[PDB]
Protein backbone atom coordinates (compact mmCIF):
# COMPACT_ATOMS: atom_id res chain seq x y z
CA UNK A 1 0.00 0.00 0.00
CA UNK A 2 3.07 2.23 -0.39
CA UNK A 3 3.12 3.79 -3.84
CA UNK A 4 6.40 4.01 -5.76
CA UNK A 5 7.73 7.18 -7.43
CA UNK A 6 9.96 6.68 -10.49
CA UNK A 7 11.33 9.86 -12.11
CA UNK A 8 13.03 8.75 -15.35
CA UNK A 9 15.44 11.31 -16.82
CA UNK A 10 17.77 11.52 -19.80
CA UNK A 11 20.76 11.09 -17.53
CA UNK A 12 19.62 9.91 -14.08
CA UNK A 13 16.95 7.56 -12.76
CA UNK A 14 15.45 8.81 -9.48
CA UNK A 15 13.40 6.20 -7.60
CA UNK A 16 11.84 5.72 -4.18
CA UNK A 17 8.62 5.55 -2.18
CA UNK A 18 5.80 8.10 -2.00
CA UNK A 19 5.93 9.86 1.36
CA UNK A 20 9.72 9.83 1.59
CA UNK A 21 11.59 13.11 1.38
CA UNK A 22 14.21 11.90 -1.14
CA UNK A 23 14.59 9.03 -3.62
CA UNK A 24 16.17 5.84 -2.29
CA UNK A 25 18.09 5.23 -5.51
CA UNK A 26 19.68 7.61 -8.00
CA UNK A 27 21.71 5.98 -10.80
CA UNK A 28 22.62 6.56 -14.44
CA UNK A 29 19.92 5.88 -16.97
CA UNK A 30 22.11 3.61 -19.10
CA UNK A 31 22.27 0.08 -20.49
CA UNK A 32 25.63 -1.33 -21.58
CA UNK A 33 26.49 -4.34 -23.75
CA UNK A 34 29.82 -5.91 -24.83
CA UNK A 35 31.61 -3.95 -27.63
CA UNK A 36 26.54 -11.03 -19.08
CA UNK A 37 24.19 -9.88 -21.83
CA UNK A 38 23.38 -6.38 -20.52
CA UNK A 39 24.47 -4.18 -17.61
CA UNK A 40 22.05 -1.57 -16.22
CA UNK A 41 22.88 1.66 -14.41
CA UNK A 42 25.45 1.56 -11.62
CA UNK A 43 27.02 -1.70 -12.84
CA UNK A 44 27.23 -0.53 -16.47
CA UNK A 45 29.21 2.57 -15.53
CA UNK A 46 31.50 0.50 -13.30
CA UNK A 47 32.61 -1.19 -16.57
CA UNK A 48 32.02 1.94 -18.68
CA UNK A 49 35.28 1.39 -20.58
CA UNK A 50 34.52 -2.13 -21.77
CA UNK A 51 30.87 -1.72 -22.87
CA UNK A 52 28.77 0.20 -25.37
CA UNK A 53 26.45 2.29 -23.19
CA UNK A 54 23.07 3.33 -24.53
CA UNK A 55 20.71 5.99 -23.22
CA UNK A 56 17.06 4.88 -23.72
CA UNK A 57 15.87 8.41 -22.90
CA UNK A 58 17.05 11.19 -25.24
CA UNK A 59 16.08 14.82 -24.75
CA UNK A 60 13.64 13.57 -22.11
CA UNK A 61 11.72 11.25 -24.49
CA UNK A 62 11.91 7.45 -24.22
CA UNK A 63 13.26 6.17 -27.54
CA UNK A 64 14.61 2.61 -26.86
CA UNK A 65 11.79 0.69 -25.19
CA UNK A 66 13.70 -2.59 -24.79
CA UNK A 67 16.44 -0.91 -22.76
CA UNK A 68 13.82 1.13 -20.90
CA UNK A 69 12.16 -2.12 -19.79
CA UNK A 70 15.64 -3.14 -18.53
CA UNK A 71 15.92 0.14 -16.59
CA UNK A 72 12.49 -0.30 -15.07
CA UNK A 73 13.25 -3.95 -14.23
CA UNK A 74 16.50 -2.87 -12.57
CA UNK A 75 14.68 -0.16 -10.59
CA UNK A 76 11.99 -2.44 -9.13
CA UNK A 77 14.06 -5.51 -8.38
CA UNK A 78 17.63 -4.39 -7.76
CA UNK A 79 17.22 -0.86 -6.37
CA UNK A 80 13.86 -0.68 -4.62
CA UNK A 81 13.72 -4.47 -3.96
CA UNK A 82 9.95 -4.60 -4.29
CA UNK A 83 7.53 -6.73 -6.22
CA UNK A 84 5.79 -4.30 -8.62
CA UNK A 85 2.50 -6.26 -8.33
CA UNK A 86 2.12 -4.89 -4.77
CA UNK A 87 2.77 -1.16 -5.37
CA UNK A 88 1.00 1.57 -7.37
CA UNK A 89 3.70 3.21 -9.49
CA UNK A 90 3.81 6.92 -10.32
CA UNK A 91 5.90 7.62 -13.43
CA UNK A 92 6.95 10.99 -14.87
CA UNK A 93 7.00 12.22 -18.45
CA UNK A 94 8.56 15.13 -20.29
CA UNK A 95 6.41 18.10 -21.31
CA UNK A 96 4.66 17.46 -24.65
CA UNK A 97 5.39 13.73 -24.43
CA UNK A 98 4.05 12.05 -27.60
CA UNK A 99 0.65 10.42 -27.14
CA UNK A 100 1.99 7.05 -28.33
CA UNK A 101 4.80 7.16 -25.75
CA UNK A 102 2.39 7.72 -22.87
CA UNK A 103 0.34 4.74 -24.00
CA UNK A 104 3.33 2.40 -24.21
CA UNK A 105 4.46 3.39 -20.70
CA UNK A 106 1.01 2.33 -19.46
CA UNK A 107 0.95 -0.86 -21.51
CA UNK A 108 4.38 -1.95 -20.24
CA UNK A 109 3.55 -1.11 -16.63
CA UNK A 110 0.30 -3.13 -16.61
CA UNK A 111 1.14 -5.98 -19.02
CA UNK A 112 4.85 -6.50 -18.30
CA UNK A 113 5.34 -5.48 -14.65
CA UNK A 114 1.73 -6.25 -13.63
CA UNK A 115 1.42 -3.14 -11.45
CA UNK A 116 -1.94 -2.81 -9.63
CA UNK A 117 -2.18 0.88 -10.48
CA UNK A 118 -0.09 3.61 -12.08
CA UNK A 119 -0.07 7.24 -13.21
CA UNK A 120 1.97 9.48 -15.52
CA UNK A 121 2.70 13.01 -14.24
CA UNK A 122 4.52 15.86 -16.03
CA UNK A 123 7.97 16.44 -14.52
CA UNK A 124 7.78 20.24 -14.45
CA UNK A 125 4.32 20.26 -12.86
CA UNK A 126 5.61 17.97 -10.08
CA UNK A 127 8.46 20.38 -9.44
CA UNK A 128 5.96 23.19 -8.97
CA UNK A 129 4.04 20.97 -6.50
CA UNK A 130 7.20 20.37 -4.45
CA UNK A 131 7.46 24.15 -3.88
CA UNK A 132 3.91 24.26 -2.52
CA UNK A 133 2.47 25.87 -5.64
CA UNK A 134 -0.12 25.01 -8.25
CA UNK A 135 0.27 28.12 -10.46
CA UNK A 136 3.69 29.23 -11.74
CA UNK A 137 6.33 28.94 -14.48
CA UNK A 138 8.88 26.15 -14.11
CA UNK A 139 12.34 26.21 -15.65
CA UNK A 140 13.35 22.52 -15.66
CA UNK A 141 16.89 21.82 -16.86
CA UNK A 142 18.45 18.40 -16.60
CA UNK A 143 21.05 16.39 -18.47
CA UNK A 144 19.44 16.27 -21.90
CA UNK A 145 16.85 19.03 -22.22
CA UNK A 146 15.60 22.35 -20.80
CA UNK A 147 11.94 23.42 -20.75
CA UNK A 148 9.96 26.41 -19.61
CA UNK A 149 6.53 25.14 -18.58
CA UNK A 150 3.86 27.65 -17.51
CA UNK A 151 1.22 26.12 -15.29
CA UNK A 152 -2.24 27.35 -14.21
CA UNK A 153 -3.87 25.39 -11.40
CA UNK A 154 -2.03 22.19 -12.16
CA UNK A 155 -2.47 22.30 -15.94
CA UNK A 156 0.58 22.93 -18.08
CA UNK A 157 -0.22 25.27 -20.94
CA UNK A 158 1.12 23.48 -24.05
CA UNK A 159 1.02 26.39 -26.50
CA UNK A 160 3.35 28.35 -24.18
CA UNK A 161 5.85 25.56 -23.34
CA UNK A 162 9.29 26.49 -24.60
CA UNK A 163 12.14 24.07 -25.27
CA UNK A 164 15.91 24.50 -25.34
CA UNK A 165 17.81 21.51 -26.69
CA UNK A 166 20.76 22.12 -24.41
CA UNK A 167 21.36 20.93 -20.87
CA UNK A 168 23.89 19.41 -18.51
CA UNK A 169 25.52 16.93 -20.91
CA UNK A 170 26.23 19.76 -23.37
CA UNK A 171 27.72 21.85 -20.56
CA UNK A 172 29.99 18.97 -19.48
CA UNK A 173 31.11 18.50 -23.09
CA UNK A 174 31.72 22.25 -23.31
CA UNK A 175 33.73 22.39 -20.06
CA UNK A 176 35.80 19.47 -21.39
CA UNK A 177 36.49 21.45 -24.58
CA UNK A 178 37.56 24.68 -22.91
CA UNK A 179 39.68 22.92 -20.30
CA UNK A 180 41.61 21.21 -23.10
CA UNK A 181 41.99 24.58 -24.86
CA UNK A 182 43.72 25.69 -21.62
CA UNK A 183 46.20 22.81 -21.91
CA UNK A 184 44.64 19.91 -20.00
CA UNK A 185 43.64 16.55 -21.47
CA UNK A 186 40.20 15.04 -20.73
CA UNK A 187 39.72 12.26 -23.28
CA UNK A 188 38.78 9.05 -21.49
CA UNK A 189 35.37 8.30 -20.03
CA UNK A 190 36.96 8.40 -16.58
CA UNK A 191 38.28 11.90 -17.39
CA UNK A 192 34.89 13.02 -18.65
CA UNK A 193 33.50 11.97 -15.27
CA UNK A 194 36.12 14.21 -13.63
CA UNK A 195 34.97 17.12 -15.80
CA UNK A 196 31.38 16.51 -14.74
CA UNK A 197 32.51 16.64 -11.10
CA UNK A 198 34.47 19.86 -11.74
CA UNK A 199 31.34 21.26 -13.37
CA UNK A 200 29.18 20.37 -10.40
CA UNK A 201 31.61 21.50 -7.68
CA UNK A 202 33.23 24.68 -9.07
CA UNK A 203 31.14 26.21 -11.88
CA UNK A 204 28.84 29.19 -11.25
CA UNK A 205 26.86 31.79 -13.17
CA UNK A 206 28.41 35.25 -13.41
CA UNK A 207 26.11 38.20 -12.81
CA UNK A 208 27.72 39.88 -15.81
CA UNK A 209 29.85 37.88 -18.23
CA UNK A 210 32.19 40.67 -19.36
CA UNK A 211 32.91 42.05 -15.89
CA UNK A 212 33.74 38.55 -14.70
CA UNK A 213 35.94 37.82 -17.71
CA UNK A 214 37.80 41.05 -16.85
CA UNK A 215 38.30 40.06 -13.20
CA UNK A 216 39.60 36.66 -14.30
CA UNK A 217 42.09 38.17 -16.74
CA UNK A 218 43.55 40.67 -14.28
CA UNK A 219 43.79 38.66 -11.05
CA UNK A 220 43.80 35.15 -9.60
CA UNK A 221 40.82 35.85 -7.37
CA UNK A 222 38.38 33.56 -9.22
CA UNK A 223 40.73 30.59 -9.61
CA UNK A 224 40.05 27.31 -7.81
CA UNK A 225 42.28 24.30 -7.19
CA UNK A 226 40.86 20.88 -8.01
CA UNK A 227 42.53 17.71 -6.74
CA UNK A 228 42.28 14.86 -9.24
CA UNK A 229 41.63 11.27 -8.06
CA UNK A 230 45.37 10.44 -8.31
CA UNK A 231 46.30 13.52 -6.22
CA UNK A 232 47.31 15.89 -9.04
CA UNK A 233 46.11 19.48 -8.59
CA UNK A 234 44.89 21.67 -11.43
CA UNK A 235 43.57 25.22 -11.27
CA UNK A 236 40.21 26.18 -12.82
CA UNK A 237 39.70 29.84 -13.78
CA UNK A 238 37.19 31.63 -16.02
CA UNK A 239 36.07 28.16 -17.17
CA UNK A 240 34.02 28.12 -13.95
CA UNK A 241 31.50 30.64 -15.30
CA UNK A 242 32.12 30.27 -19.05
CA UNK A 243 30.64 26.79 -18.93
CA UNK A 244 27.16 27.63 -17.52
CA UNK A 245 27.14 30.97 -19.42
CA UNK A 246 26.05 28.82 -22.37
CA UNK A 247 22.60 28.59 -20.73
CA UNK A 248 22.07 32.33 -21.29
CA UNK A 249 24.11 32.47 -24.54
CA UNK A 250 23.76 29.20 -26.50
CA UNK A 251 25.92 30.58 -29.34
CA UNK A 252 28.96 29.45 -27.35
CA UNK A 253 28.25 25.90 -28.53
CA UNK A 254 26.90 26.93 -31.93
CA UNK A 255 23.16 26.97 -31.16
CA UNK A 256 21.23 30.01 -32.36
CA UNK A 257 18.39 29.36 -29.87
CA UNK A 258 17.46 31.88 -27.21
CA UNK A 259 18.91 31.62 -23.72
CA UNK A 260 16.88 30.50 -20.73
CA UNK A 261 16.03 34.08 -19.69
CA UNK A 262 14.53 34.66 -23.12
CA UNK A 263 12.69 31.34 -23.37
CA UNK A 264 11.28 32.19 -19.92
CA UNK A 265 10.10 35.63 -21.05
CA UNK A 266 8.82 34.30 -24.39
CA UNK A 267 6.83 31.60 -22.58
CA UNK A 268 5.17 34.09 -20.21
CA UNK A 269 4.29 36.22 -23.24
CA UNK A 270 2.63 33.27 -25.01
CA UNK A 271 0.28 33.10 -22.00
CA UNK A 272 -2.89 35.14 -21.50
CA UNK A 273 -2.00 38.59 -20.13
CA UNK A 274 -4.19 38.04 -17.05
CA UNK A 275 -1.96 35.24 -15.69
CA UNK A 276 1.43 36.80 -16.45
CA UNK A 277 1.68 38.63 -13.11
CA UNK A 278 1.33 35.30 -11.29
CA UNK A 279 3.90 33.61 -13.58
CA UNK A 280 6.48 36.40 -13.18
CA UNK A 281 6.22 36.10 -9.38
CA UNK A 282 6.34 32.28 -9.29
CA UNK A 283 9.32 31.28 -11.37
CA UNK A 284 10.45 27.92 -10.03
CA UNK A 285 13.78 26.44 -11.05
CA UNK A 286 14.17 22.67 -11.07
CA UNK A 287 16.69 20.08 -12.23
CA UNK A 288 20.37 19.41 -11.79
CA UNK A 289 21.42 22.05 -14.29
CA UNK A 290 19.70 24.85 -12.35
CA UNK A 291 22.01 24.10 -9.40
CA UNK A 292 24.80 26.56 -10.34
CA UNK A 293 25.52 29.25 -7.73
CA UNK A 294 24.51 32.68 -9.02
CA UNK A 295 21.88 31.41 -11.44
CA UNK A 296 18.90 32.92 -9.59
CA UNK A 297 20.48 36.37 -9.30
CA UNK A 298 21.42 36.26 -12.99
CA UNK A 299 17.91 35.14 -14.01
CA UNK A 300 16.43 37.88 -11.80
CA UNK A 301 18.61 40.49 -13.52
CA UNK A 302 17.84 39.21 -17.02
CA UNK A 303 14.07 38.92 -16.67
CA UNK A 304 13.88 42.30 -14.93
CA UNK A 305 15.52 43.74 -18.04
CA UNK A 306 12.88 42.14 -20.29
CA UNK A 307 9.70 42.69 -18.23
CA UNK A 308 7.63 45.84 -17.57
CA UNK A 309 9.37 48.11 -15.10
CA UNK A 310 6.71 47.70 -12.39
CA UNK A 311 6.54 43.87 -12.47
CA UNK A 312 7.34 41.92 -9.30
CA UNK A 313 9.86 39.24 -10.39
CA UNK A 314 10.64 36.37 -8.03
CA UNK A 315 12.99 33.47 -8.73
CA UNK A 316 12.41 30.48 -6.47
CA UNK A 317 15.26 27.99 -6.37
CA UNK A 318 14.83 25.31 -3.70
CA UNK A 319 18.11 23.94 -2.32
CA UNK A 320 16.89 20.39 -3.10
CA UNK A 321 15.89 21.13 -6.68
CA UNK A 322 17.92 18.47 -8.42
CA UNK A 323 15.32 16.11 -6.88
CA UNK A 324 12.33 18.51 -7.11
CA UNK A 325 10.46 16.45 -9.73
CA UNK A 326 10.81 13.33 -7.58
CA UNK A 327 9.84 15.12 -4.35
CA UNK A 328 6.78 16.49 -6.10
CA UNK A 329 5.82 12.96 -7.11
CA UNK A 330 6.43 11.76 -3.56
CA UNK A 331 4.08 14.49 -2.39
CA UNK A 332 1.34 13.93 -4.96
CA UNK A 333 1.26 10.13 -4.59
CA UNK A 334 0.95 10.26 -0.78
CA UNK A 335 -2.01 12.68 -0.69
CA UNK A 336 -5.42 11.29 0.35
CA UNK A 337 -7.27 13.11 -2.46
CA UNK A 338 -5.01 11.57 -5.14
CA UNK A 339 -6.07 7.99 -4.44
CA UNK A 340 -8.98 7.99 -6.92
CA UNK A 341 -6.66 9.46 -9.62
CA UNK A 342 -4.68 6.24 -10.16
CA UNK A 343 -5.34 4.23 -13.26
CA UNK A 344 -6.29 0.82 -11.83
CA UNK A 345 -5.58 -2.48 -13.54
CA UNK A 346 -9.36 -2.93 -13.77
CA UNK A 347 -9.71 0.40 -15.57
CA UNK A 348 -6.84 -0.67 -17.83
CA UNK A 349 -8.53 -3.98 -18.74
CA UNK A 350 -11.69 -2.26 -19.96
CA UNK A 351 -10.34 0.80 -21.76
CA UNK A 352 -6.83 -0.21 -22.84
CA UNK A 353 -3.59 1.81 -22.98
CA UNK A 354 -5.36 4.97 -24.21
CA UNK A 355 -6.98 5.22 -20.76
CA UNK A 356 -3.88 7.32 -19.95
CA UNK A 357 -5.18 10.44 -21.77
CA UNK A 358 -8.47 10.38 -19.85
CA UNK A 359 -6.98 10.02 -16.37
CA UNK A 360 -3.53 11.68 -16.56
CA UNK A 361 -3.60 15.34 -17.55
Amino acid sequence: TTALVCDNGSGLVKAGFAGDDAPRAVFPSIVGRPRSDSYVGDEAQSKRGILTLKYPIEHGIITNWDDMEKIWHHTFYNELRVAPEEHPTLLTEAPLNPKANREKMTQIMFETFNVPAMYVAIQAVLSLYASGRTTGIVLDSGDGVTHNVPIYEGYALPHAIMRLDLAGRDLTDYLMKILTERGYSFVTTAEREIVRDIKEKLCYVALDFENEMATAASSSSLEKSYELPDGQVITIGNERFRCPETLFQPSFIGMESAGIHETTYNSIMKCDIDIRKDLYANNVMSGGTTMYPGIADRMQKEITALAPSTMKIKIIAPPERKYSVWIGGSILASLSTFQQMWITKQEYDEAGPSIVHRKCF
Binding site: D20, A25, P28, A130, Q340
Partner: peptide
Protein backbone atom coordinates in the same frame (compact mmCIF):
# COMPACT_ATOMS: atom_id res chain seq x y z
CA UNK B 1 -16.98 20.85 -5.84
CA UNK B 2 -14.31 19.31 -8.07
CA UNK B 3 -11.94 16.58 -7.00
CA UNK B 4 -9.24 18.50 -8.91
CA UNK B 5 -9.94 21.59 -6.81
CA UNK B 6 -9.52 19.59 -3.60
CA UNK B 7 -6.27 18.06 -4.83
CA UNK B 8 -4.85 21.51 -5.68
CA UNK B 9 -5.76 22.66 -2.17
CA UNK B 10 -4.17 19.50 -0.72
CA UNK B 11 -0.95 20.30 -2.62
CA UNK B 12 -0.82 23.89 -1.34
CA UNK B 13 -1.41 22.84 2.27
CA UNK B 14 0.93 19.84 2.42
CA UNK B 15 3.76 21.58 4.26
CA UNK B 16 6.03 20.44 1.43
CA UNK B 17 9.13 18.34 2.00
CA UNK B 18 9.31 18.93 5.78
CA UNK B 19 6.27 16.65 6.33
CA UNK B 20 7.94 13.78 4.42
CA UNK B 21 9.73 10.88 6.13
CA UNK B 22 13.50 11.44 6.24
CA UNK B 23 15.40 8.73 4.34
CA UNK B 24 18.91 8.11 3.04
CA UNK B 25 19.72 8.23 -0.69
CA UNK B 26 21.98 5.59 -2.22
CA UNK B 27 23.25 8.20 -4.67
CA UNK B 28 25.58 7.47 -7.63
CA UNK B 29 26.14 10.94 -9.17
Amino acid sequence: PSLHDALMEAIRSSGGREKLRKVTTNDRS
